[PDB]
Structure formats: structure tokens, C-alpha cells
């Protein structure tokens, strides 16, 4: 059955493709652009988003949120609350010549972030091995010489029956509450041992991370967003304007 929620959400999808340099320091979630990564919201809804700013005049611009949701995050957008076991398969693309030991620990509760006038990013400064000891946090240490992958399953735990599906939708400095109440924790990927790699190979290693959920259960048949569900359609030119749907009725 190609429409059973369980299978739709079971469709794997890549969320990050971080770059681990031999330079990076240990006990420090891989920082790097891409979007997030070292700090995965571990929520079912979507968390990552980019802002498309276009010109309308020399006195204003039009900002439109673009969220690259995965198959499971795409479904969680149709309901108000969710609940499930999030699964993540972390892959470290490399060669048998690279050696390392990456750590992945989960931390329940709010996520250390630095809200923006129009977005929300992680506060890497508040997630270092010094201020963020992962000694008591559930974790796993993947050794690059023995294993090349690991699938971590994170059961539902949020001192709440269900979690909101708002995600990062319309999240900023003034509105970042729905964001917190929609994940329950975050997975951190900090190198335990600095990446080793001879000059005969590359000083970098790509880390692919897949996302999908299992044992999923959604609640109310209506999006929790402040706006009607709308699929972003890439305009012909980077200057062309997009269509904005309202919530007004005649």
C-alpha cells in the first residue's frame, strides 16, 4: 500500500552532508554551514530552512521561508501534533585510510540556539566539551577504522503525550516558542578523537545523515502553521516573485 503513513515516513532522506576536517577540535559539534548538523533537532517536524529574499523596491524586500523537509517531515506538516521514534543513519564517506572516533549523544529539552531577525541557528559556543559534557548523555562512539555507519533509533521522550509540528515555520527572535515545543531534544555529533588522514588522501571526510521515523502516530487533521499548506515553486528567475497564500475568506 503506497499510502500507509508508516511506510511514507519510513522513506529515508539525507538531511546533512557535513565536512569533518583534520583541523576541527574534539568535543565540539562539527560546525560548518550546510544547516545545523552537529546539532540535529531530533524532532519529526522540519527544522532547517532558507530565506529567499527578493527585491520589490529600494524601500523593501520580500522574505519567503523555504524548508527542505524530508518525506517524514513533509507528512508531519499536515497534522498539529505528532509522536514517534526518530531514526537516523549516520554515514562517514571516507577511505580505509581515515581513522577517527565520532561521538553522537542525545540531550532532551530545549536546544541552545541563537535566534535571528528572521531565522534560528545553533549556539555552537554553548555546546563545547567544556560547557556541554556528554558523560551522562546516551551516546555512541563510531570508530572509522572498524565501522563506517551506525543507525541510531531515538524513542519518543518529551514529558508530553504529543509534540507540536510547527517546527521552524515562522521562527525568529520574537517567535521561537513553537520551535522548542516541537522536538524534545537534539543529537550532537562531536569528534572524540581528532580526524587522522595522511597527505596521500583528503584532509576532509563527508558525513551523510539520513532521516525517517517509525512507530509514527499523528493527531489532528490540520496543519499547526499560521498559514495554509503551500508547496514552494522555484520561480524562473532569482528575481521573479512567488505566490503568497493568505487566510482570508470572502
Amino acid at each position: 500500500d503506497e499510502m500507509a503513513i508508516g511506510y511514507v515516513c519510513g522513506n529515508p532522506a539525507v538531511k546533512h552532508v557535513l565536512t569533518w576536517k583534520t583541523t576541527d577540535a574534539i568535543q565540539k559539534p562539527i560546525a560548518n554551514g550546510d544547516d545545523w548538523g552537529g546539532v540535529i533537532p531530533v524532532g519529526m517536524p522540519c527544522y532547517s530552512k532558507s530565506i529567499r529574499t527578493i527585491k520589490i523596491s529600494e524601500t523593501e524586500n520580500r522574505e519567503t521561508e523555504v524548508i527542505d523537509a524530508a518525506p517524514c517531515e513533509y507528512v508531519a506538516n499536515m497534522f498539529s501534533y505528532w509522536r514517534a521514534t526518530m531514526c537516523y543513519r549516520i554515514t562517514v564517506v571516507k577511505t580505509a585510510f581515515h581513522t577517527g572516533r565520532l561521538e553522537i549523544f542525545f540531550e532532551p529539552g530545549v536546544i541552545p540556539v541563537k535566534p535571528t531577525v528572521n531565522n534560528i541557528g545553533p549556539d555552537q559556543d554553548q555546546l563545547t566539551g567544556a560547557v556541554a559534557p556528554s558523560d551522562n548523555n546516551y551516546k555512541y562512539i563510531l570508530d572509522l577504522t572498524n565501522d563506517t555507519e551506525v543507525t541510531i533509533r531515538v524513542p519518543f521522550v518529551s514529558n508530553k503525550m504529543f509534540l507540536k509540528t510547527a517546527g521552524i515555520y515562522g521562527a525568529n527572535s520574537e517567535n521561537n516558542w513553537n520551535f522548542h515545543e516541537s522536538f524534545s531534544g537534539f543529537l550532537c555529533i562531536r569528534p572524540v578523537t581528532k580526524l587522522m588522514a595522511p597527505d596521500t588522501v583528503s584532509d576532509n571526510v563527508s558525513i551523510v545523515v539520513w532521516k525517517w521515523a517509525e512507530d509514527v502516530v499523528v493527531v489532528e487533521p490540520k496543519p499547526l502553521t499560521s498559514g495554509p499548506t503551500q508547496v514552494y515553486r522555484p520561480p524562473p528567475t532569482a528575481s521573479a516573485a512567488v505566490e503568497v497564500l493568505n487566510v482570508e475568506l470572502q
Binding site: V17, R52, D68, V93
Partner: protein, 243 residues
């Protein structure tokens, strides 16, 4: 050794429907060698119309660690405009693509309809110091629907959601794939019919990571083989499509 000939008479009506066609005359007067013998060597395989399922080099890609052209261009995490579409290493417009190689087209000549699944296999061959990853995948009518519904007009999370298979230069030497008949049209017009169906793709999950000096370079290369399965060729015709 006698009666090295035939003569007159016969019966009323006739069929002798050899495959197609019939003909109807008064039976027939005809010789045959008195009980003819093989007299020759036919024990080295026989083969059949299964010809279409023979793997054939349907293109050869050459990946070079030298990140310059859009051949190394890694999957973009976002796609805000069509001018910044997703860049692939190579794409094939199946099934016509596989029907032009190995001389399979000239094989199914004079046939009208066809039904089958395209079988693919990418055989990699990079050296021990070349790291990188790639996600194969295929789409149905990708170039036959609203652009927004294209695998090239979606985020990295969306492209990776399409039915495909991963490929790591340091783990699997080759990956296969099957493209179920995805024909909403019972069959497929070999003559007429644009035969146009969906384009297949090959996106680089991550940038081909290679050791940094210049003068030596690090290559990967690949070999793309294709063939058909669950084949179905049925109604003959005098027409054939030279497109």
C-alpha cells in the same frame, strides 16, 4: 534415392498458416528431401529474443578529483530558482536510450508494441585513496510534468527521497537497479509514439574528495550497462521508427 519430383492433384481448400498469413489453394504438391538429416553442428547455445536482456555499455562516465566543471558539483541543499537547478553527472532518457545501443532497435524491427523493465548496473573502479559518495535514483515522467515536480527542482532531502541506491567509492564496486515498466500506456509504440518516457539520473551526494596536489590527479570513472527484462514484443508491422 527415386521419385526425384512431384506431380498433380490435391485436396480442397488449405491453410498451412505458417506463423502469420494463410493462403488458400487446393492443398499442395511439394517435395522435401526423403527424410532429411541435420548434417551440421548446432550444439553451441541457441539464444532467443532474450537478446534485449544482454548487458551493453550504454555510456561511460569519467569522474576526476579535479573539482572544476559541474561534474563534481555536489547536490545542492536548496533550490530557490530554476537558474540554480540541481546538477547531475549524467542523465539518460529511457527506455529509448537502451533501445539504441547494442543494436537492439534493429532487432525489434517490424514490431509494434513493447513492454519491459529497464535493468541497470553501474560498475565503479576508483583507487584506494579516492573517497566520495553518489546516489543513483530514477524518476517517472520527470521531464513530462510540471517543472516544480521534477527531481531537479527540489532540495537535497527531496532528491534523496526518490527511489534510488547509494554508491561509495570505497565500499561497493558496482550497484544495480531496476526500472519497473512505468508505462501508463499498455505497451509502447515502437513506430510512432515518441517513446518518450522518463529521464534517469545520477546525482553526487558528496563532492568527489581526493588528495590535494596537482600533476597527479585522482580519477574514478564508471561503466554504465543496461538491458531489459520482462520483455513483451507482439504485433508486427512494416513500419519502424528511425528517430
Amino acid at each position: 534415392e527415386l521419385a526425384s519430383s512431384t506431380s498433380e492433384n490435391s485436396v480442397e481448400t488449405q491453410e498451412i498458416t505458417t506463423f502469420h498469413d494463410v493462403e488458400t489453394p487446393n492443398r499442395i504438391d511439394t517435395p522435401m528431401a526423403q527424410d532429411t538429416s541435420s548434417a551440421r553442428n548446432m550444439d553451441d547455445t541457441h539464444s532467443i529474443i532474450q537478446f534485449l536482456q544482454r548487458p551493453v555499455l550504454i555510456d561511460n562516465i569519467e569522474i576526476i578529483a579535479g573539482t572544476t566543471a559541474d561534474a563534481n558539483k555536489p547536490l545542492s541543499r536548496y533550490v530557490l530558482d530554476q537558474q540554480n537547478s540541481q546538477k547531475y553527472v549524467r542523465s539518460w532518457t529511457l527506455p529509448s536510450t537502451v533501445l539504441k545501443a547494442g543494436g537492439k532497435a534493429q532487432k525489434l524491427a517490424n514490431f509494434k508494441y513493447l513492454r519491459c523493465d529497464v535493468q541497470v548496473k553501474l560498475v565503479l573502479n576508483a583507487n584506494p585513496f579516492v573517497a566520495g559518495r553518489m546516489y543513483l535514483a530514477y524518476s517517472p515522467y520527470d521531464d513530462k510534468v510540471d517543472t516544480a515536480r521534477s527531481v531537479l527542482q527540489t532540495s537535497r532531502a527531496g532528491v534523496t527521497g526518490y527511489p534510488g541506491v547509494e554508491l561509495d567509492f570505497q565500499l561497493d564496486n558496482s550497484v544495480e537497479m531496476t526500472i519497473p515498466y512505468a508505462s501508463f500506456q499498455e505497451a509502447y509504440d515502437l513506430v510512432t509514439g515518441t517513446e518518450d518516457f522518463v529521464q534517469l539520473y545520477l546525482f553526487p551526494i558528496t563532492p568527489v574528495l581526493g588528495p590535494k596536489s596537482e600533476s597527479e590527479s585522482s580519477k574514478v570513472d564508471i561503466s554504465v550497462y543496461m538491458w531489459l527484462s520482462n520483455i513483451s514484443l507482439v504485433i508486427p508491422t512494416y513500419r519502424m521508427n528511425p528517430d
